[PDB]
Coordinates of N, CA and C in Angstrom, one line a residue:
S1 N 0.8 -1.2 0.0 CA 0.0 0.0 0.0 C 0.9 1.3 0.0
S2 N 0.6 2.2 -0.9 CA 1.1 3.5 -0.9 C 0.0 4.5 -0.3
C3 N -0.2 5.6 -1.1 CA -0.7 6.8 -0.5 C -2.2 6.7 -0.1
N4 N -3.1 6.7 -1.1 CA -4.5 6.3 -0.9 C -4.6 4.8 -0.8
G5 N -3.9 4.2 0.2 CA -3.8 2.7 0.3 C -3.6 2.3 1.8
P6 N -4.1 1.1 2.2 CA -4.4 0.7 3.6 C -3.3 -0.1 4.3
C7 N -2.8 0.3 5.4 CA -2.0 -0.5 6.3 C -2.9 -1.3 7.2
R8 N -2.3 -2.4 7.7 CA -3.0 -3.3 8.7 C -3.1 -2.5 10.0
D9 N -3.2 -3.2 11.1 CA -3.2 -2.5 12.4 C -2.0 -1.5 12.5
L10 N -0.8 -2.0 12.3 CA 0.4 -1.2 12.3 C 0.9 -0.9 10.9
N11 N 2.0 -0.2 10.7 CA 2.5 0.3 9.4 C 3.3 -0.7 8.6
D12 N 2.8 -1.9 8.4 CA 3.3 -2.9 7.5 C 2.9 -2.4 6.1
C13 N 3.7 -1.5 5.5 CA 3.5 -1.0 4.2 C 4.7 -0.3 3.5
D14 N 4.6 0.3 2.3 CA 5.7 0.7 1.4 C 6.6 1.8 1.9
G15 N 7.8 1.8 1.4 CA 8.9 2.8 1.8 C 9.2 3.0 3.3
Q16 N 9.4 4.2 3.7 CA 9.5 4.6 5.1 C 8.2 5.2 5.6
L17 N 7.1 4.7 5.1 CA 5.7 5.2 5.3 C 5.0 4.6 6.5
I18 N 4.4 5.5 7.3 CA 3.7 5.1 8.6 C 2.2 5.0 8.3
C19 N 1.5 4.6 9.4 CA 0.0 4.5 9.3 C -0.7 5.6 10.0
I20 N -1.4 6.4 9.3 CA -2.4 7.4 9.8 C -3.8 7.0 9.5
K21 N -4.6 6.7 10.5 CA -5.9 6.1 10.3 C -5.7 4.6 9.9
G22 N -6.3 4.2 8.8 CA -6.0 2.8 8.2 C -5.3 3.0 6.9
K23 N -4.7 4.1 6.6 CA -4.1 4.5 5.3 C -2.6 4.9 5.5
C24 N -1.8 4.7 4.5 CA -0.3 5.0 4.6 C 0.1 6.4 4.2
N25 N -0.3 7.3 5.1 CA 0.2 8.7 5.0 C 1.7 8.8 5.4
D26 N 2.3 10.0 5.2 CA 3.7 10.2 5.4 C 4.1 10.3 6.9
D27 N 5.3 10.0 7.2 CA 6.0 10.2 8.5 C 6.4 11.7 8.6
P28 N 5.9 12.5 9.5 CA 6.3 13.9 9.7 C 7.8 14.2 9.9
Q29 N 8.5 13.4 10.7 CA 9.9 13.6 11.1 C 10.9 13.2 10.0
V30 N 10.4 12.3 9.1 CA 11.1 11.9 7.9 C 11.3 13.1 7.0
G31 N 10.2 14.0 6.9 CA 10.2 15.2 6.1 C 9.8 15.0 4.6
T32 N 9.4 13.8 4.2 CA 9.0 13.4 2.8 C 7.5 13.6 2.6
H33 N 7.2 14.2 1.5 CA 5.9 14.7 1.1 C 5.4 13.9 -0.1
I34 N 5.5 12.6 0.1 CA 5.2 11.6 -1.0 C 3.7 11.4 -1.2
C35 N 2.9 11.5 -0.2 CA 1.5 11.2 -0.3 C 0.6 12.5 -0.1
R36 N 1.3 13.6 -0.3 CA 0.7 14.9 -0.2 C -0.4 15.1 -1.3
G37 N -1.6 15.6 -0.8 CA -2.7 15.9 -1.7 C -3.7 14.7 -1.7
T38 N -3.3 13.5 -1.4 CA -4.2 12.4 -1.3 C -5.0 12.4 0.0
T39 N -6.2 11.8 -0.1 CA -7.1 11.8 1.1 C -7.9 10.4 1.2
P40 N -8.4 10.1 2.5 CA -9.3 9.0 2.6 C -10.7 9.4 2.8
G41 N -16.8 3.7 11.8 CA -17.0 4.8 12.7 C -18.0 5.9 12.2
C42 N -19.3 5.7 12.5 CA -20.2 6.9 12.4 C -19.9 7.8 13.6
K43 N -19.6 9.0 13.4 CA -19.3 10.0 14.5 C -20.1 11.3 14.3
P44 N -20.3 12.1 15.4 CA -21.0 13.4 15.3 C -20.3 14.3 14.4
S45 N -21.1 15.1 13.7 CA -20.5 16.1 12.7 C -20.2 17.4 13.5
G46 N -20.8 17.6 14.7 CA -20.6 18.8 15.5 C -21.7 18.8 16.5
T47 N -22.1 20.0 16.9 CA -23.2 20.3 17.9 C -24.1 21.5 17.5
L48 N -25.2 21.5 18.1 CA -26.1 22.6 18.0 C -26.5 22.9 19.5
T49 N -26.7 24.1 19.9 CA -27.1 24.5 21.2 C -28.5 24.9 21.3
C50 N -29.3 24.4 22.2 CA -30.5 25.1 22.6 C -30.8 24.7 24.0
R51 N -31.7 25.6 24.6 CA -31.8 25.6 26.0 C -30.4 26.0 26.5
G52 N -29.9 25.3 27.4 CA -28.5 25.3 27.8 C -27.7 24.3 26.9
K53 N -28.3 23.2 26.6 CA -27.6 22.0 26.2 C -27.0 22.1 24.8
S54 N -25.7 21.6 24.7 CA -25.1 21.2 23.4 C -25.7 19.8 23.1
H55 N -26.1 19.6 21.9 CA -26.7 18.4 21.4 C -25.8 18.0 20.2
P56 N -25.4 16.7 20.1 CA -24.7 16.3 18.9 C -25.5 16.4 17.6
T57 N -24.8 16.6 16.5 CA -25.4 16.6 15.2 C -24.8 15.4 14.5
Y58 N -25.4 14.9 13.5 CA -24.9 13.8 12.7 C -25.5 13.8 11.2
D59 N -24.6 13.4 10.3 CA -24.9 13.2 8.9 C -25.2 11.7 8.7
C60 N -24.7 10.9 9.6 CA -24.7 9.4 9.4 C -25.4 8.7 10.6
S61 N -25.7 7.4 10.3 CA -26.3 6.6 11.3 C -25.5 5.2 11.3
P62 N -25.6 4.4 12.4 CA -25.1 3.1 12.3 C -25.5 2.3 11.1
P63 N -24.8 1.2 10.8 CA -25.1 0.3 9.6 C -26.4 -0.4 9.7
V64 N -27.1 -0.4 8.6 CA -28.4 -1.1 8.6 C -28.1 -2.6 8.4
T65 N -28.7 -3.4 9.2 CA -28.5 -4.8 9.1 C -29.8 -5.6 9.1
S66 N -29.8 -6.9 9.0 CA -30.9 -7.7 9.2 C -31.5 -7.5 10.6
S67 N -30.7 -7.0 11.5 CA -31.3 -6.7 12.9 C -30.6 -5.5 13.5
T68 N -31.1 -4.3 13.1 CA -30.5 -3.0 13.5 C -31.0 -2.5 14.8
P69 N -30.1 -2.3 15.8 CA -30.5 -1.8 17.0 C -30.9 -0.3 16.9
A70 N -31.9 0.1 17.6 CA -32.4 1.5 17.5 C -33.1 1.9 18.8
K71 N -33.4 3.2 18.9 CA -34.3 3.7 19.9 C -35.6 4.1 19.2
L72 N -36.7 3.7 19.8 CA -38.0 4.1 19.4 C -38.4 5.3 20.2
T73 N -38.8 6.3 19.5 CA -39.5 7.4 20.1 C -40.9 7.6 19.5
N74 N -41.6 8.5 20.0 CA -43.0 8.8 19.5 C -43.1 10.1 18.8
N75 N -43.8 10.1 17.6 CA -44.0 11.4 16.9 C -45.4 11.5 16.4
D76 N -45.9 12.7 16.3 CA -47.2 13.2 15.7 C -46.9 13.6 14.3
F77 N -47.5 12.8 13.4 CA -47.4 13.0 11.9 C -48.6 13.8 11.3
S78 N -49.5 14.1 12.2 CA -50.8 14.7 11.8 C -50.7 16.2 11.6
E79 N -51.7 16.7 10.9 CA -51.7 18.1 10.6 C -51.9 18.9 11.8
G80 N -52.4 18.3 12.9 CA -52.5 19.0 14.2 C -51.2 19.4 14.9
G81 N -50.1 18.7 14.5 CA -49.1 18.3 15.4 C -47.8 19.1 15.7
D82 N -46.9 18.4 16.3 CA -45.6 18.9 16.7 C -44.6 19.2 15.5
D83 N -44.6 18.3 14.5 CA -43.6 18.4 13.4 C -43.7 19.8 12.7
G84 N -42.6 20.2 12.2 CA -42.6 21.3 11.2 C -43.1 20.9 9.8
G85 N -44.4 20.8 9.7 CA -44.9 20.5 8.3 C -45.0 19.1 7.9
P86 N -45.4 18.8 6.6 CA -45.7 17.6 6.1 C -44.4 16.6 6.1
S87 N -44.7 15.3 6.1 CA -43.6 14.3 6.0 C -42.8 14.4 4.7
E88 N -41.5 14.2 4.8 CA -40.6 14.4 3.7 C -40.9 13.5 2.5
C89 N -41.3 12.3 2.7 CA -41.3 11.3 1.6 C -42.4 11.6 0.6
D90 N -43.5 12.1 1.1 CA -44.7 12.3 0.2 C -45.4 13.6 0.3
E91 N -44.7 14.6 1.0 CA -45.2 15.9 1.2 C -46.7 15.8 1.7
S92 N -47.0 14.9 2.6 CA -48.3 15.0 3.2 C -48.3 14.7 4.7
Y93 N -49.4 15.1 5.3 CA -49.6 14.7 6.7 C -50.2 13.3 6.8
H94 N -50.1 12.7 7.9 CA -50.7 11.4 8.1 C -51.4 11.3 9.5
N95 N -52.3 10.4 9.6 CA -52.9 10.0 10.8 C -52.0 9.2 11.7
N96 N -52.1 9.4 13.0 CA -51.3 8.6 13.9 C -51.8 7.2 14.2
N97 N -53.0 6.9 13.7 CA -53.4 5.5 13.5 C -52.8 4.7 12.4
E98 N -52.1 5.4 11.5 CA -51.3 4.7 10.5 C -50.0 4.2 11.2
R99 N -49.5 3.0 10.9 CA -48.3 2.4 11.2 C -47.2 3.0 10.3
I100 N -46.6 4.1 10.8 CA -45.6 4.9 10.0 C -44.5 5.3 10.9
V101 N -43.3 5.5 10.3 CA -42.2 6.0 11.1 C -41.4 7.1 10.3
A102 N -40.6 7.8 11.1 CA -39.5 8.6 10.6 C -38.2 7.9 11.0
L103 N -37.1 8.1 10.2 CA -35.8 7.5 10.5 C -34.7 8.6 10.6
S104 N -33.8 8.5 11.5 CA -32.6 9.4 11.6 C -32.1 9.6 10.3
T105 N -31.6 10.8 10.0 CA -31.0 11.3 8.8 C -30.2 10.2 8.0
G106 N -29.2 9.6 8.7 CA -28.4 8.6 8.0 C -29.2 7.4 7.5
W107 N -30.1 6.8 8.3 CA -31.0 5.7 7.8 C -32.0 6.2 6.8
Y108 N -32.5 7.5 7.0 CA -33.3 8.1 6.0 C -32.6 8.1 4.6
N109 N -31.3 8.3 4.6 CA -30.4 8.1 3.4 C -31.0 8.8 2.1
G110 N -31.3 10.1 2.3 CA -31.7 10.9 1.2 C -33.0 10.5 0.5
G111 N -33.8 9.7 1.2 CA -35.1 9.3 0.7 C -35.2 7.9 0.2
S112 N -34.0 7.1 0.3 CA -34.0 5.8 -0.4 C -34.9 4.8 0.2
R113 N -35.4 5.0 1.4 CA -36.3 4.0 2.1 C -37.7 4.6 2.1
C114 N -38.0 5.7 1.5 CA -39.4 6.2 1.5 C -40.3 5.2 0.9
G115 N -41.5 5.1 1.5 CA -42.6 4.2 1.1 C -42.3 2.7 1.4
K116 N -41.2 2.4 1.9 CA -40.9 1.0 2.2 C -41.3 0.7 3.6
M117 N -41.6 -0.6 3.8 CA -41.9 -1.2 5.1 C -40.7 -1.6 5.8
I118 N -40.7 -1.4 7.1 CA -39.7 -2.0 8.0 C -40.5 -2.8 9.0
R119 N -39.8 -3.7 9.6 CA -40.2 -4.6 10.7 C -39.5 -4.2 12.0
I120 N -40.2 -3.8 12.9 CA -39.7 -3.4 14.2 C -40.0 -4.5 15.2
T121 N -39.0 -4.9 16.0 CA -39.2 -5.9 17.1 C -39.0 -5.2 18.5
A122 N -39.9 -5.4 19.4 CA -39.7 -4.9 20.8 C -39.1 -6.0 21.7
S123 N -38.8 -5.6 23.0 CA -38.2 -6.5 23.9 C -39.2 -7.6 24.5
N124 N -40.5 -7.3 24.4 CA -41.5 -8.2 24.8 C -41.8 -9.2 23.6
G125 N -41.0 -9.1 22.6 CA -41.2 -10.0 21.4 C -42.3 -9.7 20.4
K126 N -43.0 -8.6 20.7 CA -44.0 -8.1 19.7 C -43.2 -7.5 18.5
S127 N -43.8 -7.6 17.3 CA -43.3 -6.9 16.1 C -44.4 -6.3 15.3
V128 N -44.0 -5.3 14.6 CA -45.0 -4.5 13.8 C -44.2 -4.1 12.6
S129 N -45.0 -4.0 11.5 CA -44.6 -3.5 10.3 C -45.1 -2.1 10.1
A130 N -44.1 -1.2 9.7 CA -44.4 0.2 9.5 C -43.8 0.8 8.3
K131 N -44.5 1.8 7.7 CA -44.0 2.5 6.5 C -43.1 3.7 6.8
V132 N -42.0 3.7 6.1 CA -41.1 4.9 6.2 C -41.8 6.1 5.5
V133 N -42.0 7.2 6.2 CA -42.7 8.4 5.6 C -41.9 9.7 5.8
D134 N -40.9 9.7 6.7 CA -40.3 11.0 7.1 C -38.9 10.8 7.6
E135 N -38.1 11.9 7.7 CA -36.8 12.0 8.2 C -36.9 12.6 9.6
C136 N -36.1 12.0 10.5 CA -35.9 12.5 11.8 C -34.5 13.2 11.7
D137 N -34.5 14.5 11.6 CA -33.4 15.3 11.1 C -32.3 15.4 12.2
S138 N -31.2 14.8 12.1 CA -30.1 14.9 13.1 C -29.0 16.0 12.7
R139 N -29.3 16.8 11.6 CA -28.4 17.9 11.2 C -28.8 19.2 11.7
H140 N -30.1 19.4 11.9 CA -30.7 20.6 12.1 C -31.7 20.5 13.3
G141 N -31.9 21.7 13.9 CA -32.8 21.9 15.0 C -32.5 23.1 15.8
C142 N -33.1 23.2 17.0 CA -32.8 24.2 18.0 C -33.2 25.7 17.6
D143 N -34.0 25.8 16.6 CA -34.4 27.1 16.0 C -35.9 27.4 15.8
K144 N -36.3 28.6 15.4 CA -37.7 29.0 15.1 C -38.4 27.9 14.3
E145 N -37.8 27.6 13.1 CA -38.3 26.7 12.1 C -38.6 25.2 12.6
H146 N -37.9 24.8 13.6 CA -38.0 23.4 14.2 C -38.7 23.5 15.5
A147 N -39.2 24.6 15.9 CA -39.9 24.9 17.2 C -38.9 24.8 18.5
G148 N -37.7 25.1 18.2 CA -36.7 25.0 19.3 C -36.4 23.6 19.9
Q149 N -36.8 22.5 19.2 CA -36.5 21.1 19.6 C -35.1 20.7 19.1
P150 N -34.3 19.9 19.9 CA -33.0 19.5 19.5 C -33.0 18.7 18.3
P151 N -31.8 18.6 17.6 CA -31.8 17.7 16.5 C -32.0 16.3 17.0
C152 N -32.5 15.5 16.1 CA -32.7 14.0 16.3 C -31.3 13.4 16.6
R153 N -31.4 12.3 17.4 CA -30.2 11.4 17.5 C -30.1 10.6 16.2
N154 N -29.0 9.9 16.1 CA -28.6 9.2 14.9 C -29.1 7.8 14.7
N155 N -29.7 7.2 15.7 CA -30.2 5.8 15.7 C -31.6 5.7 16.1
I156 N -32.5 6.6 15.5 CA -33.9 6.8 16.0 C -34.8 6.3 14.9
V157 N -35.8 5.5 15.3 CA -37.0 5.2 14.6 C -38.1 5.9 15.4
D158 N -38.7 6.9 14.7 CA -39.7 7.8 15.4 C -41.0 7.3 14.9
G159 N -41.7 6.6 15.8 CA -43.0 5.9 15.5 C -44.3 6.6 15.9
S160 N -45.3 6.4 15.1 CA -46.6 6.8 15.4 C -47.2 6.1 16.6
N161 N -48.2 6.7 17.2 CA -49.1 6.0 18.2 C -49.4 4.6 17.9
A162 N -49.8 4.4 16.6 CA -50.2 3.0 16.2 C -49.0 2.0 16.3
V163 N -47.8 2.5 16.0 CA -46.6 1.6 16.1 C -46.4 1.2 17.6
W164 N -46.4 2.1 18.5 CA -46.3 1.9 20.0 C -47.3 0.9 20.5
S165 N -48.6 1.2 20.1 CA -49.7 0.3 20.4 C -49.6 -1.1 19.9
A166 N -49.3 -1.2 18.6 CA -49.0 -2.6 18.0 C -48.0 -3.4 18.8
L167 N -47.1 -2.7 19.4 CA -45.9 -3.3 20.1 C -46.2 -3.5 21.6
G168 N -47.4 -3.1 22.0 CA -47.8 -3.2 23.4 C -47.0 -2.3 24.3
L169 N -46.5 -1.2 23.8 CA -45.7 -0.3 24.6 C -46.4 0.9 24.9
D170 N -46.0 1.4 26.1 CA -46.5 2.7 26.6 C -45.6 3.9 26.1
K171 N -46.2 4.8 25.4 CA -45.4 5.9 24.8 C -45.0 6.9 25.8
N172 N -45.6 6.9 27.0 CA -45.2 7.8 28.1 C -43.8 7.5 28.7
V173 N -43.3 6.3 28.5 CA -41.9 6.0 28.9 C -40.9 6.8 27.9
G174 N -41.4 7.2 26.8 CA -40.7 8.2 25.9 C -39.8 7.6 24.9
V175 N -39.0 6.6 25.3 CA -38.0 6.0 24.5 C -37.6 4.5 25.0
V176 N -37.6 3.6 24.1 CA -37.4 2.2 24.3 C -36.4 1.7 23.3
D177 N -35.8 0.6 23.6 CA -34.9 -0.1 22.7 C -35.6 -1.1 21.9
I178 N -35.2 -1.1 20.6 CA -35.8 -2.1 19.6 C -34.8 -2.5 18.7
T179 N -35.1 -3.4 17.8 CA -34.3 -3.6 16.6 C -35.2 -3.6 15.4
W180 N -34.6 -3.3 14.3 CA -35.4 -3.3 13.0 C -34.7 -3.8 11.8
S181 N -35.5 -4.1 10.8 CA -34.9 -4.4 9.5 C -35.9 -4.0 8.4
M182 N -35.5 -3.9 7.2 CA -36.4 -3.9 6.1 C -37.3 -5.1 6.1
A183 N -38.6 -4.9 5.6 CA -39.6 -5.9 5.6 C -40.0 -6.2 4.1

């Protein structure tokens, strides 16, 4: 491996080249600028402040698998509600008797899962199928336009009343652990 190229755990690679990240960048004390100009963990992109708190922001979410761990929260998708306007996938409002969810920005993946069903499993072993209709935005929040609410976390399935009920869960606990997959 040279410049845009990967070392193992340690710097088992070409020339007098060391390991920065998982790539063979240059050694600073050597003074050689061989890999100059070349470039290469879901982590927070930064923070937004509201109230007092700093809240992390994210562009990404953990990897989607056949059994993806997540936190389930509760959201009002109706025209009456909390959200800033219509759901992203279809520019409409929905009833909270519909089995529907929003997904953290990374899982939302620019709309690639809109209109798809996911299967959510709770800790009591109940499962429910729900349609993806919206993004739980983990990049933006804490302002006029979002009602001063923090940005979403990165591992969130934000479910309707009907999703919580189908799962036998009390929405007043606010947040519970689940797993999910495409259905």
